[PDB]
Amino acid sequence: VSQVRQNYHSDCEAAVNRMLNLELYASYTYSSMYAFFDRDDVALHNVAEFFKEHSHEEREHAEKFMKYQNKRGGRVVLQDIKKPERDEWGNTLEAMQAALQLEKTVNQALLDLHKLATDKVDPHLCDFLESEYLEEQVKDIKRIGDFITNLKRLGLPENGMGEYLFDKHSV
Amino acid sequence: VSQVRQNYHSDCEAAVNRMLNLELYASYTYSSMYAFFDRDDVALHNVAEFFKEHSHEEREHAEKFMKYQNKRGGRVVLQDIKKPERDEWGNTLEAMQAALQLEKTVNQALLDLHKLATDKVDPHLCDFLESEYLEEQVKDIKRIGDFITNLKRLGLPENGMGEYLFDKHSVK
């Protein structure tokens, strides 16, 4: 038992480890979309850089969980980082739609981690989650949603021109 | 009642009053430590300053509670501030050790207030505790722990050369 640990459930410790992995998984996925839109036969660089940046942001969320772990006195246990569901992502719309699902998923795991944290009466974990993750999620979901709606408006999947515009004007 | 009072429970006002006293108590104890490391026969000046600093911080944590008490409509009520447990702190290791406990004690008094505040449906007192105290506590507790580990890596309490390096390298 760490000299530092106080009011930290084992269940919450394992959960954070589990969450740390979800975040790395999501980052890995955003990285795949980046490399896809960077293919010469896709070539949408603004769409690519938008995923490369989301990938990095996601990596941070993970580093941030590692720190939270040690500060509470739990121990980081790492798992395999599984490869993303697909090797290719079709077009901007499809990618955005997978993104939207990815974020909703990640957000549900955080929502569960908070509910778990409430059960175990750990207000420090709740505030961490609230302050660093919860609101950050709804902003990403809103942002992404706004895009999908614009992509559809712009003629996707069929409208080549609409995809080209979205790349130039929306990111 | 206070014209300003709303959703503030007697039991919570009283706990805030106790919490303030605990802060002051901690303040006085770190104060005691500074004095000790300042003595010619202890002479660890950076460690001493560390405890002087933490002391001021703790005193700030107690004022923040006064401001709050008044802010919610409740009434500050002061109690004696009891002298620290010891007049002498042995060395850096013992002192860091006593401070961990002190910090973990204060932490718990605060988690107990958050509990009390949750049960009394007082989201304001909960967000106050959360954003002003709770995170500063786990940070203090990790910083002190980090220290103990190094203080043990360096050879304490036996090794003096190690305690000397700690004053020069782990603090200011």
Added chain:
Amino acid sequence: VSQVRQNYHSDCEAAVNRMLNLELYASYTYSSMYAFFDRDDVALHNVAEFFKEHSHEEREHAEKFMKYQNKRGGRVVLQDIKKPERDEWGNTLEAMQAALQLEKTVNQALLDLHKLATDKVDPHLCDFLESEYLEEQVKDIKRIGDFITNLKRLGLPENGMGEYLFDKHSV
């Protein structure tokens, strides 16, 4: 075939996909060391941050591989990133010894991917490896070598003081 592809053998393309996965694995391992020297019962922060950055550096060698793949016309295919081979790292000397082996493992894979290149007669791939990876590797290796030498000099694994000084002066 990609309109872009000229003189990229598929052997090299698949070997590039593997180097990629390797860099990520290396990066994952370093992330683990970072989180280790950060636990309250270890607490060598300067050592931790040296692994955190090495982790980032690796991460970027990986991205640099994805970008290459697209530039040549090859297709990026991702695999699982495997959890590091340990969960705790003992101490600064053990960790540094682990890193030496890991780095020499990557160096070798690079060297192979270069012989593979030389043999398929791909001068661009060769010059790429020579310019962005080969010398970075022997530099990073010479660096860790030095560290080990000093760690051993400082009394590791037993000399608590030696280890604590290394944290303050060598990193």
Added chain:
Amino acid sequence: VSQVRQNYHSDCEAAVNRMLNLELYASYTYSSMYAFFDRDDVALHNVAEFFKEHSHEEREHAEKFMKYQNKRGGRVVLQDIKKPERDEWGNTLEAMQAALQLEKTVNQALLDLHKLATDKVDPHLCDFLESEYLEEQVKDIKRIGDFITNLKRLGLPENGMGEYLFDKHSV
């Protein structure tokens, strides 16, 4: 013999001369394309400026060869620079397609020379090609590809509005 020549095979010297002439030829063509898009019945001025640009880059590449020739103590021998295959380039998609082949033809020419150099053990001519030409080539090839894909996304050659948009955003 030049007082300066050392390890410079006559076959390499000759191939440098031909590589020089290829460069000039590539220049002249891009120049033609410039002239085309600057016509009042074509009128894609950014597109034209892109090709004027490339035209300069290539004359630069020819010059670097003249100087390399004299650096090695070989003799620069000039040839006719023959006119481009067309006097008119149809449209942006065709111009880009024509340049994609043009670059690949130049690229292969270089790779062939790099091999001639390997067979004659001229590490210098070899490094020279690696550092000044090779990576530059696959960059230009990737870039023109990206364009061709985007150009198709925009419905070329049929869609005029797309061609307009391409000239206003990609170049």
